[PDB]
């Protein structure tokens, strides 16, 4: 019935992508000089978390960051003076995500409990308990002071309205368990990597998926747009990181090595997009040169697997939050 039509459409899409794949990113960037070796040292170590950490998010100003740990505590640090500005308790100990609003006044927090919690920093109580998801909530990001997009265990990603506490729109049509998402710099598009090999692209205003990418061969644990907003890199469990492109749907470059076999938990880009910092299960991060797919450095010093990663808006510092209860800010 419709299966033949679906197969024909998939074949047509593959043929079109192959037709648009005349060259390769490696060939064009071959003539460029290598980035060289980058050495990073732990400028600041943040301590005070009782157990493992799953998420962190930098503020609009690079001073403040919020980290989520399974302690039931949501601590907001001051990166410059390594001081704990706030330590928010949690109703549920199990937490898998956190977010720091661009306004700097709101913080999101969700975990195995389907509810997403929004906290008011300037007033520290739960402003709204966004409910309506079915599976475990995976990621949160703030479109604005009033709109937040969440991705949960079920196949659906939802866009919420904080003032009304209701799902303005729901992005469905996926197969696996959605794990991570990243917003565009213009806050008009976002993507979502999941346990399914696909990593779809969604339109916030229309609410319908636009493009899908299936380069990977395993579950996707992390995703992040290029600073240009025209590309993104996904971290899978196949020990590979791939750079996709929105204009040309086919995957451009792949980041992998024979020595590493562990999966990727968190990825992030540098301010210029040259370095693709990626967290691994080998208790250390790897700095990948985006244009050449050649490793540029190693971020070692974590006693357990790295589960969080972020680069400041100014691009000055990079912080990794591992299952080791200690944050580590590099430079």
């Amino acid at each position: 019935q419709l299966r033949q039509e679906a197969e024909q459409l998939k074949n047509q899409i593959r043929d079109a992508r192959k037709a648009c794949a005349d060259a390769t990113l490696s060939q064009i960037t071959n003539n460029i000089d290598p980035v060289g070796r980058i050495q990073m040292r732990t400028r600041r170590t943040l301590r005070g978390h009782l157990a493992k950490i799953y998420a962190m998010h930098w503020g609009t100003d690079s001073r403040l960051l919020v980290s989520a740990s399974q302690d039931g505590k949501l601590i907001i640090w001051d990166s410059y003076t390594t001081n704990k500005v706030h330590a928010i308790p949690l109703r549920s100990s199990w937490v898998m995500t956190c977010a720091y609003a661009p306004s700097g006044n709101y913080v999101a927090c969700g975990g195995l409990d389907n509810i997403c919690s929004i906290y008011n920093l300037k007033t520290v109580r739960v402003s709204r308990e966004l409910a309506g998801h079915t599976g475990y909530l995976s990621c949160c990001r703030f479109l604005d002071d009033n709109q937040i997009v969440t991705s949960s265990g079920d196949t659906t990603c939802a866009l919420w309205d904080i003032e009304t506490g209701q799902q303005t729109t729901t992005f469905t049509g996926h197969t696996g368990d959605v794990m991570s998402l990243s917003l565009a710099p213009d806050t008009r598009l976002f993507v979502s990597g999941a346990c399914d090999a696909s990593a779809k692209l969604w339109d916030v205003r229309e609410g319908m998926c636009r493009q899908t990418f299936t380069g990977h061969e395993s579950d996707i644990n992390a995703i992040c747009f290029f600073p240009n907003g025209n590309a993104f890199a996904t971290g899978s469990d196949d020990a590979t990181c791939r750079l996709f492109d929105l204009r040309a749907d086919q995957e451009l470059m792949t980041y992998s090595h024979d020595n590493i076999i562990c999966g990727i938990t968190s990825v992030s880009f540098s301010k210029s997009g040259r370095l693709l910092l990626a967290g691994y299960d080998d208790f250390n991060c790897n700095v990948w040169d985006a244009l050449k797919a050649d490793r540029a450095g190693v971020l070692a010093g974590h006693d357990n697997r790295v589960s969080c990663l972020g680069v400041t808006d100014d691009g000055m510092a990079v912080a990794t939050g591992s299952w080791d209860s200690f944050l580590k800010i590099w430079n």
């Binding site: 990113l25 600041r44 998926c209 210029s272 997009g273 040259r274």
Partner: protein, 52 residues
Amino acid sequence: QARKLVEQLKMEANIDRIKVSKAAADLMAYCEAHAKEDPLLTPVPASENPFR
């Protein structure tokens, strides 16, 4: 439920694409243009470094 899947595939298949050469050129040009303002690409002076 296959009707929704085939409709979505048809909707997303009819989009305009550019060659990988153009996208790679744009990415390389952006990386080269914004390379100076990257504090991680090249170490910043200790005076300009906040964490130090």
